[PDB]
Amino acid sequence: WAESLIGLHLGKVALITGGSAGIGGQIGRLLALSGARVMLAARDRHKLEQMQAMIQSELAEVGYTDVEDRVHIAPGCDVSSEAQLADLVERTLSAFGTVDYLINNAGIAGVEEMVIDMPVEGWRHTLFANLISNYSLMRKLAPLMKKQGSGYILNVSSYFGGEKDAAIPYPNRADYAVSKAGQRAMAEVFARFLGPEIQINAIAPGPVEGDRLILENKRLNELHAALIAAARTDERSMHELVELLLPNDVAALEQNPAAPTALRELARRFRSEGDPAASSSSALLNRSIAAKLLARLHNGGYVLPADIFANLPNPPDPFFTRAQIDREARKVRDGIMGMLYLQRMPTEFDVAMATVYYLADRVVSGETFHPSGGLRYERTPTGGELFGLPSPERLAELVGSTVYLIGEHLTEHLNLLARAYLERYGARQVVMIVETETGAETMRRLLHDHVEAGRLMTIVAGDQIEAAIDQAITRYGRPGPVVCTPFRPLPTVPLVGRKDSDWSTVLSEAEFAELCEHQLTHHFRVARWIALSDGARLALVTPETTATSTTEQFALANFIKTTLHAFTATIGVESERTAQRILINQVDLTRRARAEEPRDPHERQQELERFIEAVLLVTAPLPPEADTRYAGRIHRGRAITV
């Protein structure tokens, strides 16, 4: 079986992150069998040493000599650590000289929560481990690769990272989905810069065979929605409503005449549509669900003590039995199985084998290979240019609305939008949330007339966008339309260096992390906070490309547009599963080609009008009667191109 592999990658040096187990261990093993010298990177030393022993023993069996020199290890390597990525490169280069193949395989699961329950630092941690680490290792190894005249960067993405011009929602996994989409987007935009010397592609396998949370999240969403629904028609404070759950008795809450209908019917739902073995039938929640519920309520603006769930009775272990956990696991399994065309789940070996053959192909770059797959999962095509504007009736509902505009560098766009909302659509007020005081003054000067009239308010967010949104809520009231534009423009730095250059001017690893902060994390933070604000319609706006934008800005803007589509599509689905169920969509100011951009003042006037129409389309209210299952999914998680 291994005879087909002999001599396939002979003379090549491969660096494989996550190389001690899973798909990475298999890629490392098969690349070594192919004749390549491999460096396996992971955290645990023991696991790496056991894998090294397995590979070396198998190389000896097929006939290799000096097997110790063909398989090396790098323990204590956490890809989320920049310093650890620098030691990895130094250790690899010291053991084998230049790296031919960079296999960016490591990929953590992430937070595994809905965006509204996802700590900001958790999201950043996933981006560091799964995405930023990929640019970082490329940045260190691409100069060597270019100098020797050849190289290969392979990012191990997922089917769940979507595709070119198509986003895939991955609910409870937004951080993971975005990082996967970014690995693919990187290969797509860096290919023209890394070529002809370096190839850069992605692999996007579907689910693979190898090495409860949908129910625990269901319990959280159910309690939260009922608490918010009961708050609508009950005089008691959220504090007093939460107190009804404090005995943590499902039967008592159901039989409580003093408890609101929404909470009584929820307890009836828990007991009837529940397993009598699992304590999720007798108890309302555990402290993990309680802390998440409290954080949702606190983020939403409700006042409750931090210790409200301190004296909460811990449901005697288990809170969920062995039976109900395996039942949902089998429900998930048959779901994944029933999505697979071939209905025979691929293995880690299958993906690695198909990947090791694909690495031999020298005439592809900027592509996403699917070594396994063909899933029945739903796609959100992203990039529709043909759209008009909402009906005049939906536009008439903007009369007296409260608008939040978030931004700083897109001053012409912010001024135009603010004026369109107040002058054309009779909005009551616009709250301009900027980053800096200079940004606030620039906007107050452009909108002097509306500032004087009390129609345009300014707030300086700095790096505290959430607290700034709370200031706007308390001071000016909850918003209808929310337009989130980036504070920062895209950098104008080289993305590759000259063959014999030091690469000292090329976009650094810290600058790539900053790009993600300002162009991805900025929108995530706004969305996470606004998703709990009832009646909000959020437009996430990507940076602007023009006919004069640099070639590097086109690449970085297209990297952001694709990566953010994964976020927009994921949160679009997540919001339909919440009580507030707001609207979230993406408006793209980035295009793929310079030739498509306006070339004169008339075409620019046309473009800026299209921007206003696209924002109005996604910020016009969707009446509750019109928010059907059919129309609801149509008005969430979409992306349109100006």
Please tell me what DSSP assigns to residue 420.
Answer: I
CA 167 vs. chain centroid, Å, equals: 11
Q: Which residues inside 97-116 make contact with a copy of itself, applying CB under 8 A? A: none
Based on the shown chain and the rule CB under 6 A, indicate whether residue 19 belongs to the binding site for ligand NAP. yes
Based on the shown chain and the rule CB under 8 A, indicate whether residue 540 belongs to the binding site for a copy of itself. no
At 110, list the tokens: 């992430």
Please tell me what DSSP assigns to residue 63.
Answer: T
Q: Which residues inside 584-623 make contact with a copy of itself, applying CB under 8 A? A: 585, 592-593, 595-600, 602-603, 606-607, 613, 617-618
Among 20, 52, 172, 382, binds a copy of itself (CB under 8 A): 382
**How, if at all, do strands 583-588 and 198-203 pair?**
unpaired
- Give the CB-nearest residue to ligand NAP: 22
Based on the shown chain and the rule CB under 6 A, indicate whether residue 481 belongs to the binding site for ligand NAP. no
Based on the shown chain and the rule CB under 8 A, indicate whether residue 152 belongs to the binding site for a copy of itself. no
CB of 601 to ligand NAP, least distance (A): 41
User: Which region, judged by CB under 6 A, interacts with ligand NAP, from 202-210, 218-226, 322-330, 375-383?
Assistant: 202-210
The residue written with tokens 């009446």 in the block is 623
Q: 63-98 in b/e burial notation, b at 16+ Cβ within 10 A?
A: ebeebeebbbbbeebbbbbeebbeebbebbbeebee
Q: For residues 372 and 208, is the Cβ–Cβ distance under 8 A? A: yes
Residues contacting 178, CB < 8 A, separation 6+: 126, 127, 131, 520, 524, 563, 564, 566, 567, 570
Q: How far is CA 493 from CA 192, 304, 508, 512, 560, in A?
A: 16, 48, 9, 11, 16
Q: Would the annotation count 58 as a binding residue? A: no
Among 8, 35, 54, 78, binds ligand NAP (CB under 6 A): 78
Among 149, 381, 426, 477, binds a copy of itself (CB under 8 A): 381
Distance, in Å, from the CA atom of 178 to the CA atom of 277, rounded to the nearest integer, reads 38
The residue written with tokens 């009906």 in the block is 391
CB of 78 to a copy of itself, least distance (A): 31
CB of 203 to ligand NAP, least distance (A): 8
Residue 273, contacted partner among ligand NAP, a copy of itself, none, CB below 5-8 A by kind: none
Residue 389, contacted partner among a copy of itself, ligand NAP, none, CB below 5-8 A by kind: a copy of itself
Distance, in Å, from the CA atom of 171 to the CA atom of 188, rounded to the nearest integer, reads 25
Q: Which residues inside 326-365 make contact with ligand NAP, applying CB under 6 A? A: none
User: Which region, judged by CB under 8 A, interacts with a copy of itself, from 106-114, 115-123, 423-431, 632-640?
Assistant: 632-640
Based on the shown chain and the rule CB under 6 A, indicate whether residue 182 belongs to the binding site for ligand NAP. no
The CA radius of gyration of the chain, in Å to the nearest whole number, is 27
Residue 8 C-beta-side C-alpha neighbours within 13 Å: 19
Among 6, 35, 47, 269, binds ligand NAP (CB under 6 A): 47
Count other C-beta atoms under 10 Å from residue 599's C-beta: 12
Residues contacting 525, CB < 8 A, separation 6+: 120, 465, 466
Please tell me what DSSP assigns to residue 366.
Answer: S
Distance, in Å, from the CA atom of 480 to the CA atom of 396, rounded to the nearest integer, reads 13
Amino acid at 232: R
Taking the least distance from each CB to ligand NAP, the nearer of 209 and 243 is 209
Among 364, 399, 453, 510, binds a copy of itself (CB under 8 A): 364
Cis-peptide, bond into residue 315, ω within 30° of zero: no
CB of 213 to a copy of itself, least distance (A): 23
Distance, in Å, from the CA atom of 450 to the CA atom of 313, rounded to the nearest integer, reads 55
Residue 392, contacted partner among ligand NAP, a copy of itself, none, CB below 5-8 A by kind: a copy of itself
Q: Would the annotation count 23 as a binding residue? A: yes
User: Which region, judged by CB under 6 A, interacts with ligand NAP, from 71-79, 187-195, 273-281, 337-345?
Assistant: 71-79
Residue 561 C-beta-side C-alpha neighbours within 13 Å: 29
Based on the shown chain and the rule CB under 8 A, indicate whether residue 545 belongs to the binding site for a copy of itself. no
Residues contacting 528, CB < 8 A, separation 6+: 115, 116, 118, 120, 299, 466
CB of 576 to a copy of itself, least distance (A): 13
Among 92, 105, 286, 619, binds ligand NAP (CB under 6 A): 105
CB of 94 to ligand NAP, least distance (A): 19
Q: Would the annotation count 87 as a binding residue? A: no
Question: What is the total count of residues that contact a copy of itself (CB under 8 A)?
Answer: 82
Based on the shown chain and the rule CB under 8 A, indicate whether residue 161 belongs to the binding site for a copy of itself. no
The residue written with tokens 């997922």 in the block is 158
Q: Which residues inside 385-414 make contact with a copy of itself, applying CB under 8 A? A: 385-392
Distance, in Å, from the CA atom of 584 to the CA atom of 565, rounded to the nearest integer, reads 11
Breaks in the chain (C to N > 2.5 A) come right after 211
Based on the shown chain and the rule CB under 8 A, indicate whether residue 337 belongs to the binding site for a copy of itself. no
Q: How far is CA 68 from CA 39, 58, 71, 98, 106, in A?
A: 11, 12, 6, 18, 23
Per-position x/- string for 203-242, each x denoting binding to ligand NAP as judged by CB under 6 A, each - no binding = --x-xx-xx-------------------------------
Based on the shown chain and the rule CB under 6 A, indicate whether residue 132 belongs to the binding site for ligand NAP. no
Based on the shown chain and the rule CB under 8 A, indicate whether residue 207 belongs to the binding site for a copy of itself. no
User: Which region, judged by CB under 8 A, interacts with a copy of itself, from 63-71, 309-317, 338-346, 466-474?
Assistant: 338-346
CA-angle at 289, arms to 288 and 290, nearest 5°:
90
Strand order in the sheet with 537-541: 456-460, 429-434, 402-406, 481-484, 537-541, 583-588, 639-641
Residues contacting 3, CB < 8 A, separation 6+: none
Q: How far is CA 218 from CA 177, 252, 277, in A?
A: 20, 21, 18
Based on the shown chain and the rule CB under 8 A, indicate whether residue 633 belongs to the binding site for a copy of itself. yes
Q: How far is CA 211 from CA 7, 328, 334, 390, in A?
A: 30, 18, 17, 48
Based on the shown chain and the rule CB under 6 A, indicate whether residue 115 belongs to the binding site for ligand NAP. no
Residue 423, contacted partner among ligand NAP, a copy of itself, none, CB below 5-8 A by kind: none
Based on the shown chain and the rule CB under 6 A, indicate whether residue 429 belongs to the binding site for ligand NAP. no
Residue 210, contacted partner among ligand NAP, a copy of itself, none, CB below 5-8 A by kind: ligand NAP
Question: What is the total count of residues that contact ligand NAP (CB under 6 A)?
Answer: 28
Based on the shown chain and the rule CB under 6 A, indicate whether residue 271 belongs to the binding site for ligand NAP. no
Q: Would the annotation count 21 as a binding residue? A: yes
CB of 636 to a copy of itself, least distance (A): 9
Binding site for ligand NAP (CB under 6 A): 17-24, 42-44, 47, 77-80, 105-108, 129, 156, 158, 205, 207-208, 210-211
| Binding-site annotation, residues for NADP(+) | 18, 20-21, 23, 43-44, 47, 78-79, 105, 176, 180, 208
Q: Binding site, residues?
A: 18, 20-21, 23, 43-44, 47, 78-79, 105, 176, 180, 208, 231, 234, 545, 575, 580, 597, 607
Q: Which residues are annotated as a binding site for Mg(2+)?
A: 231, 234, 545, 575, 580, 597, 607
